[PDB]
Symmetry: C2
Subunit: 135 residues, 2 copies
């Protein structure tokens, strides 16, 4: 019915308590972790983690990347950079998307494109969290 | 009597408004910036910025590093990683200090020491902000 979740970064402890479920942006694709899920160790791609706290209440946190560790009764997500949805800045994310979008139409190769493509994923991800929080 | 301050990072806008003064950890040493200060462009060393908002009220933000831009009437600090003092985690910072302190007594050279020495500066800095916030 519930399991323990620890969302931490090198400096902060974003979350620590009981949740009913979470959705992360795993290495293999979108992941849904429930109570009693089988052990797992995966890398997180720049995106977000939806935390469904007990009583069916949500909290959104943007993850630039990190590591997901599912273990018996305990789940831990070590984040590179983690920012709460209410703290993201729309103008700042919008800005990033622009710098990236033009980095794309500057691609003199296929190496610099994948890097501008990465930059964009992060920007798109931030905007998704921003909008998901408003609701 | 007052000047405009913008504290921003790639994703967030930590602060934006009128302040009476600020103290950053500049490239040359601790800096005090007041209204009417002469133009400056400096790099910020891992440390903190004390924001003295109008009415003599303080707010502490940890900076892993960044850039300080003093211009007529407007002051901007672009941060690499910025975390509000109330969001730092003492156990997490304490942890970092330990990993660093032992990285030091592992120094097989003078190259790896300066890197462990850097890691420690950041950890010490975080703890300073944490304690400065409590007060």
């Amino acid at each position: 019915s519930t399991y323990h979740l620890d969302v931490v970064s090198a400096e902060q402890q974003m979350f620590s308590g009981l949740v009913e479920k979470i959705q992360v942006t795993g290495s293999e694709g979108e992941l849904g972790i429930y109570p009693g899920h089988a052990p797992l160790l995966t890398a997180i791609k720049p995106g977000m983690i939806r935390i469904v706290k007990q009583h069916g209440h949500e909290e959104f946190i943007y993850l630039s990347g990190g590591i997901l560790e599912v273990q018996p009764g305990n789940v831990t997500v070590l984040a590179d950079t983690a920012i709460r949805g209410q703290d993201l800045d729309e103008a700042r994310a919008m800005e990033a998307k622009r710098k990236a979008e033009e980095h794309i139409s500057s691609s003199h190769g296929d190496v610099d494109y994948a890097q501008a493509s990465a930059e964009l994923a992060k920007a798109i991800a931030q905007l998704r969290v921003i909008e998901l929080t408003k609701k």
